[PDB]
Protein backbone atom coordinates (compact mmCIF):
# COMPACT_ATOMS: atom_id res chain seq x y z
CA UNK A 1 0.00 0.00 0.00
CA UNK A 2 1.45 3.33 -1.15
CA UNK A 3 1.31 6.47 1.05
CA UNK A 4 -1.25 7.92 -1.38
CA UNK A 5 -3.52 4.88 -1.24
CA UNK A 6 -3.39 4.59 2.56
CA UNK A 7 -4.15 8.30 2.87
CA UNK A 8 -7.13 8.19 0.51
CA UNK A 9 -8.60 5.06 2.12
CA UNK A 10 -8.12 6.50 5.61
CA UNK A 11 -9.88 9.70 4.57
CA UNK A 12 -12.91 7.72 3.34
CA UNK A 13 -13.16 5.88 6.65
CA UNK A 14 -12.82 9.03 8.75
CA UNK A 15 -15.33 10.81 6.51
CA UNK A 16 -18.11 8.25 6.89
CA UNK A 17 -17.36 7.92 10.60
CA UNK A 18 -17.47 11.71 11.14
CA UNK A 19 -14.05 11.35 12.78
CA UNK A 20 -13.05 15.03 12.85
CA UNK A 21 -9.61 14.75 14.48
CA UNK A 22 -8.74 11.62 12.52
CA UNK A 23 -9.85 13.38 9.34
CA UNK A 24 -7.67 16.44 10.01
CA UNK A 25 -4.71 14.32 11.13
CA UNK A 26 -4.46 13.06 7.54
CA UNK A 27 -4.01 16.60 6.19
CA UNK A 28 -0.85 18.62 5.63
CA UNK A 29 -0.83 22.16 7.05
CA UNK A 30 -0.92 23.56 3.51
CA UNK A 31 -3.61 21.18 2.24
CA UNK A 32 -5.85 22.41 -0.58
CA UNK A 33 -9.23 20.77 -1.21
CA UNK A 34 -10.97 21.37 -4.54
CA UNK A 35 -14.11 19.24 -4.45
CA UNK A 36 -15.11 20.02 -7.12
CA UNK A 37 -12.47 21.84 -9.14
CA UNK A 38 -14.04 25.20 -9.97
CA UNK A 39 -16.74 27.32 -8.36
CA UNK A 40 -19.37 25.49 -6.32
CA UNK A 41 -21.16 25.41 -2.96
CA UNK A 42 -18.28 23.31 -1.63
CA UNK A 43 -15.71 25.47 -3.46
CA UNK A 44 -16.98 29.10 -3.10
CA UNK A 45 -14.19 31.08 -4.81
CA UNK A 46 -13.37 28.23 -7.19
CA UNK A 47 -9.74 28.14 -6.02
CA UNK A 48 -10.19 25.52 -3.29
CA UNK A 49 -10.33 25.34 0.51
CA UNK A 50 -6.86 26.21 1.82
CA UNK A 51 -5.26 25.36 5.17
CA UNK A 52 -6.23 23.05 8.02
CA UNK A 53 -8.33 25.72 9.74
CA UNK A 54 -10.47 26.25 6.63
CA UNK A 55 -10.90 22.54 5.84
CA UNK A 56 -11.86 22.13 9.48
CA UNK A 57 -14.76 24.49 8.83
CA UNK A 58 -15.43 22.59 5.60
CA UNK A 59 -15.72 19.37 7.61
CA UNK A 60 -18.05 20.92 10.18
CA UNK A 61 -20.31 22.22 7.41
CA UNK A 62 -20.48 19.53 4.72
CA UNK A 63 -19.48 16.32 6.55
CA UNK A 64 -20.39 16.59 10.24
CA UNK A 65 -24.16 16.95 9.78
CA UNK A 66 -24.45 14.54 6.84
CA UNK A 67 -24.64 10.77 6.52
CA UNK A 68 -22.00 10.17 3.86
CA UNK A 69 -21.39 6.99 1.89
CA UNK A 70 -18.23 6.87 -0.22
CA UNK A 71 -18.02 4.00 -2.70
CA UNK A 72 -14.73 3.30 -4.48
CA UNK A 73 -15.64 2.15 -7.98
CA UNK A 74 -12.10 1.98 -9.35
CA UNK A 75 -8.55 2.92 -8.37
CA UNK A 76 -5.85 4.29 -10.68
CA UNK A 77 -2.33 4.29 -9.23
CA UNK A 78 0.32 6.45 -10.89
CA UNK A 79 4.01 5.61 -11.20
CA UNK A 80 4.52 7.76 -8.11
CA UNK A 81 3.61 6.43 -4.64
CA UNK A 82 2.64 9.99 -3.69
CA UNK A 83 -0.18 10.47 -6.22
CA UNK A 84 -3.28 8.42 -6.96
CA UNK A 85 -6.68 8.74 -8.63
CA UNK A 86 -10.04 7.13 -7.81
CA UNK A 87 -13.46 6.84 -9.36
CA UNK A 88 -15.68 7.53 -6.35
CA UNK A 89 -19.42 7.68 -5.77
CA UNK A 90 -20.35 10.07 -2.97
CA UNK A 91 -23.88 9.72 -1.58
CA UNK A 92 -25.12 12.28 0.95
CA UNK A 93 -28.19 12.10 3.19
CA UNK A 94 -29.13 15.14 5.27
CA UNK A 95 -31.36 15.57 8.31
CA UNK A 96 -34.88 15.39 6.89
CA UNK A 97 -34.54 12.81 4.13
CA UNK A 98 -33.06 14.93 1.35
CA UNK A 99 -30.24 13.22 -0.55
CA UNK A 100 -27.62 13.96 -3.19
CA UNK A 101 -25.31 11.67 -5.13
CA UNK A 102 -22.42 12.23 -7.49
CA UNK A 103 -19.75 10.21 -9.25
CA UNK A 104 -16.42 11.61 -10.39
CA UNK A 105 -12.65 11.36 -10.60
CA UNK A 106 -10.80 12.25 -7.41
CA UNK A 107 -7.05 12.81 -7.40
CA UNK A 108 -4.93 12.74 -4.26
CA UNK A 109 -1.41 13.97 -3.54
CA UNK A 110 0.59 13.46 -0.36
CA UNK A 111 3.88 14.97 0.79
CA UNK A 112 6.91 12.90 1.80
CA UNK A 113 5.57 12.80 5.35
CA UNK A 114 2.53 11.04 3.87
CA UNK A 115 0.07 13.85 4.58
CA UNK A 116 -2.53 14.99 2.03
CA UNK A 117 -1.58 18.21 0.24
CA UNK A 118 -4.16 18.04 -2.56
CA UNK A 119 -7.62 16.59 -3.06
CA UNK A 120 -9.35 17.49 -6.32
CA UNK A 121 -12.70 16.34 -7.69
CA UNK A 122 -13.82 16.20 -11.32
CA UNK A 123 -17.59 16.63 -11.54
CA UNK A 124 -20.32 19.22 -12.07
CA UNK A 125 -24.02 19.73 -11.29
CA UNK A 126 -25.06 17.96 -14.50
CA UNK A 127 -23.55 14.74 -13.14
CA UNK A 128 -25.37 15.16 -9.81
CA UNK A 129 -28.77 13.77 -8.86
CA UNK A 130 -31.03 14.64 -5.93
CA UNK A 131 -33.65 12.80 -3.89
C1 LIG B 1 -21.88 17.10 0.74
C2 LIG B 1 -21.24 17.25 -0.61
O3 LIG B 1 -21.39 18.27 -1.29
C4 LIG B 1 -20.41 16.10 -1.10
O5 LIG B 1 -21.02 14.94 -0.54
C6 LIG B 1 -20.39 15.94 -2.64
C7 LIG B 1 -19.08 15.19 -2.95
C8 LIG B 1 -18.44 14.95 -1.59
C9 LIG B 1 -16.93 14.68 -1.53
C10 LIG B 1 -16.55 13.44 -2.35
C11 LIG B 1 -15.05 13.23 -2.31
C12 LIG B 1 -14.56 13.07 -0.89
C13 LIG B 1 -13.65 12.11 -0.62
C14 LIG B 1 -12.86 12.14 0.63
O15 LIG B 1 -11.98 11.30 0.81
C16 LIG B 1 -13.16 13.21 1.65
C17 LIG B 1 -14.59 13.71 1.52
C18 LIG B 1 -14.94 14.18 0.09
C19 LIG B 1 -14.09 15.43 -0.24
C20 LIG B 1 -16.48 14.49 -0.04
C21 LIG B 1 -17.00 15.63 0.87
C22 LIG B 1 -18.51 15.90 0.71
C23 LIG B 1 -18.90 16.17 -0.75
C24 LIG B 1 -18.30 17.53 -1.21
NA1 LIG C 1 7.09 16.76 0.85
NA1 LIG D 1 7.13 21.68 1.45
Measured in degrees and rounded to the nearest 5, phi and psi for residue 59 equal -60, -50
CB atoms within 10 A of CB 73: 9
- Which residues, at least 6 apart from 3, have a Cβ–Cβ distance to it below 8 Å? 81, 82, 110, 114
Whether ligand 1 lies within 6 angstroms of the CB of 107 is answered as no
Q: What is the Cα–Cα distance from 10 to 74, expressed in whole angstroms?
A: 16
In the chain, how many domains are there? 1
The alpha carbon dihedral of 19, 25, 29, 30 has a sign of negative
What method did the depositors use to determine the structure? X-ray
Ligand nearest to the CA of 11: 1
Q: What is the Cα–Cα distance from 17 to 105, expressed in whole angstroms?
A: 22
The alpha carbon dihedral of 23, 93, 101, 33 has a sign of negative
Q: What is the Cα–Cα distance from 128 to 76, expressed in whole angstroms?
A: 22
CA of 58 to the centre of ligand 2 (A): 24
Q: Which atom of ligand 1 is nearest to the CA of 106?
A: 11
**116-122 vs 27-34, strand pairing mode:** parallel
- Cβ 103 vs Cβ 126: under 8 Å: no
For position 51, which CATH number holds?
Answer: 3.10.450.50
Whether ligand 1 lies within 6 angstroms of the CB of 48 is answered as no
Range of the domain at 124: 1-131
Amino acid sequence: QSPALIASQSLWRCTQAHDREGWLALMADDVVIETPIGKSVTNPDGSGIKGKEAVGAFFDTHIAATRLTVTCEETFPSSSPDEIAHILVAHSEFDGGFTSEVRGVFTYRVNKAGLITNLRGYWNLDMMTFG
